[model samples]
Target: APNDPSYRQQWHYFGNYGVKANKVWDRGFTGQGVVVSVVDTGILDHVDLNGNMLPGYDFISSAPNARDGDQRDNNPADEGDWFDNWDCGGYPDPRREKKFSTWHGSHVAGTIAAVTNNGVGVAGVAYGAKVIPVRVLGKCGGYDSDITDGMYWSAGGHIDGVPDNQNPAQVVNMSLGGGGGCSQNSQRMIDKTTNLGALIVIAAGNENQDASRTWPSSCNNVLSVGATTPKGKRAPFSNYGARVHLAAPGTNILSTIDVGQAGPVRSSYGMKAGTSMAAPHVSGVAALVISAANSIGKTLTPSELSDILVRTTSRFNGRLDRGLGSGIVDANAAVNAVLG
Candidate 1:
């Protein structure tokens, strides 16, 4: 897949601290037949993501926050989340800070499964895997109710008002969260999805504090991820704690991004830093592991898949300030474990 023009920019997909996806790709297990859902702001159509998308839903309930000037609908394309200071209605915090649309969901989805070997943009970790974009976050942020509902529906569970997910996901990547302990609503939905055989991977957040205080990441049965710089050290802004199941490259990491927001041109790419960029690496690796196992006529439960991810990690050197779960995830090791 290095044939993709921008593939060289994707160090996290091939670097030492990367999941070592090349080894698995060489073996032809590129996550085909697997659906990895990205529950985030939403996704945009890009050259790199052309054929990898599945029909997804917009779960944002608040008309204003939805950014589409309306309530929920089937369209999941990001309409931009840029906000002016006055738009936030007297809020003094950074949430009201001026900024461009993040296009965060598109970037996350690209890292997980952008089109590979297409002689175009960069490749994805699980390049052959299909991506399901779920819109939960929008203008300012999202609600726990909407996020949980998205989680439930992503794994084929039905919500009262939402239609059934036509293409249920085998893996779910949630790169958004808020400051708080796990909520009952979130925990219940997570439990339901895990029981439904979906593996949820989440970010430990960029607060640089103990991850135990973060929702979704701290929730049980989910794989929480921390961010690491290119040198394998913890990203200065990444949260750390026992709750983090693994770490992945996030600092200055480049991937697909909507042009004009992160760059001067449309459909261009840019670099970002945070566990938001890290969690999708794990999601892609999980997709690869599942694909490998499924090809051999074996299906591992969510718990079993998480165990493989944890057990096959390569520990970072010079740790101790805070726990970061097992260590950085290794994609090659994980797929090999599944093959064995």
Candidate 2:
């Protein structure tokens, strides 16, 4: 069993009969019609993501059409997104040389829906899903107004002046959040999108505190996700609370990054540690569940799918703080639940 050590403990690499094999990638099922909107810094285009990316928008007006060119959106095809300026005023500081974070969006995007079994990089939980890049964070992070606009537009809401988005995402992943109480306006947008049948998946936050205090994720309708380690333990840095819908692998996770930034760049991949890295796993799983439902001539409302996902989790005997919500995501169980 000489597996690729590079991905060891990074992904759930079960053999054909391994627990992950039963559900993760059904092989026969590809997330054909599903499109997931990634709202963050930006994604780096990579060969692994070839033909998987859709024409996306950049809400970071500061970057002039999302072409900031540092390693923000790092991809050989795109290659001009990372802003690594230390003075950009980001949490943990934006590294020297680069004006923004390096390849963050690309790494997160790849983890959620990278093409599976492609003989390169690592496979994603819902590898068959398509990625729609929506850049909301940029130099010096982003504004709440712009973040709100990105969410509304990505979820198919009509923003004044912005052309009506012809393509609306079935699932929108918000990997970034600010420490603020859920305002009435934010709550309304979340409610409207889920009502429209879009599954909104938000990171539980990286503050290492009670996630219920965070915006958007704390909202009742959002499928809030916390991070877990390789051994199924809650990550030390992951926030937890009763609001967390489920947990997924998030520590030391390797995926794509914006080009030219420091990382296992190129086809090499790189590692990131945070709940931001964990949200996409849920988004990818949601895509597969939707696809499975569509295949069986079944229609699932956003609420129903959310319940199904929460209900099918792998319950554990861990601490309540760590085991909040349902349980760890059982990819096979989740997919099959819909098919049945």
Candidate 3:
């Protein structure tokens, strides 16, 4: 907990003890030049993330059209956290209001690219990385079909009626998940994006089940990520298996919140835990790697970058949770690997 005097910031802990210690940050490569597309609930346009959010699209049928207007949607109060019908925060669900503001997506986004050194909210993993919001999940969560479409749109895949995107993201982060194997349809969509030189980082599920049973994350090409605790231990809730590619800090993590009707506001930071939180750490680190490479006049293919990231992780002594993957990520090592 942050209240604990021993509570080391995620960045500080990973900076010192984790395999990648301090190198990425020292290189002035804070995910700049890398754009990440987040497919989940809509973002709140919080003040801490001003000027960092790229024009995004919403695929939720109930909400306004994806290209409607950039009228930042921050009305009504945030519906509190609810997993199994139990609410975590004080949010009422009246069906209509239930359709608004899910902090999960905003929390994940903030962890990946929240404003840095701004003297306001906490620093993001990829502080300078740009966010491309793709709203997919909504009330009752999102269907796999809708989420698959959201993923396609996120990677700039040409959906029939969607407008062409001028700027596609270097990576896509999917923090939400469900049961079942990777459908052929989903794999095709993933291939479409990866074929276009984009990387994907997905949560390894929070059910603590074997990832082979999960979709998307279990897919062969995408980088499957699991969650870890601040002390480099696997988070109990993290789902693991041979399918996992890497692990990252996810327990008790904090980030941005939704805004009011006016615009982006600064009062939206909170803490949550899940593999959803861990995926952004890798996405942020990917931004760092690509940014550093660009700074030095070097460019790497998405596959090459993915390999470098996996090879640079912190290897553990004993076998870890299946979802924990290769071990904790070493952002500095992954970025520095590009140097040589």
Candidate 4:
């Protein structure tokens, strides 16, 4: 709707299933002064994300697997995650597909806060929000231990080995998780972060099963988000269950990506689909809500903001038996609720 060149490609940002972020934008709430930590693969350099980035950390522990050829470091730039059969311990699977660096964190971060109306790339949900890119995932994925530490540090909680986060996030977007229930270590970190007043929003996974089977999403005190199609129905691949707090558009979603192999060589954009894409939509809205509330001289607690998001959602047509939480998130409604 707004004149960003790629805004038309970002169907989710304006649609009912999208949280209707443009409506909040019209009200002059672009998530200014809000910090959202994207805890996934590290962010890549992109023109759309130029001023929106805050300094971040790399928590990947294994030197080789970290793909930067080193252990944890100050630099959070993503190197390509492409791996060969030999890369995975010579596992005998000839069909193993060679993967491009997904630029997963960059995509997720772009969806939350890519610079809007820049007349270049697509618009983001919370266009004025700042992003802290915490690298946890690396080649062949990452460990729960590393991810847990990223979560803690991003929320301003103490992690033994890392420096304290100077730009502590008000909202943390976790777009990565796996099969199995929540781990004890991860739950502890989640608890501590929640106590420190950061709201954690997690993906429900793309396994097409009860989301309760996924860790972190199934973890307590987090907003577990599921994926909705453009038509506002459950995405076939999106995990669902009683644990989902709400749904957001995740189909054919276009956002920023890194085309570079070594470091940021070029900025690119592409389409991706999964609950991973869905999670950032809600995270962006959370930033919008917080920004809106703060503008009105009100400070909403994480619980209060979460409650507003859930309670003000737009219900899907027909009976609510799809396990899509209360319904699809409505950014306008949530922001209006905050303003009121």
Could you tell me every candidate's TM-score relative to the true structure? Answer: 0.96, 0.84, 0.83, 0.95
Worst 10 residues of 4 by lDDT: 88-97
Flag regions of model 4 displaced more than 4 Å: 93-97, 260-265, 317-321
Q: In model 3, how large is the Cα lDDT of residue 229?
A: 72
Of the candidates numbered 1 and 3, which has the greater TM-score value? 1
Better of 1 and 3 by lDDT: 1
Candidate topping TM-score: 1
Off by over 4 Å in 3: 1-8, 11-22, 62-102, 258-266, 317-323
TM-score sort, best first: 1, 4, 2, 3
Candidate 3 lDDT score relative to the true structure: 0.71
Q: How many residue pairs clash in each candidate?
A: 1, 21, 8, 0
Q: After superposition, how far is residue 295 of candidate 2 from its true place, in Å?
A: 0.7
Give the alpha-carbon lDDT of every model: 0.87, 0.69, 0.71, 0.86
Query: Runs in model 1 with CA error above 4 Å?
Result: 93-95, 262-265
Candidate 2 lDDT by residue in tens digits, 222-281: 888888776667888888878788876667777765445433355547778888887887
Against the true structure, candidate 4 has what lDDT?
Answer: 0.86
Ranking by lDDT: 1, 4, 3, 2
Could you tell me the lDDT of residue 334 within candidate 4? 94
Give model 1's TM-score versus the native structure: 0.96
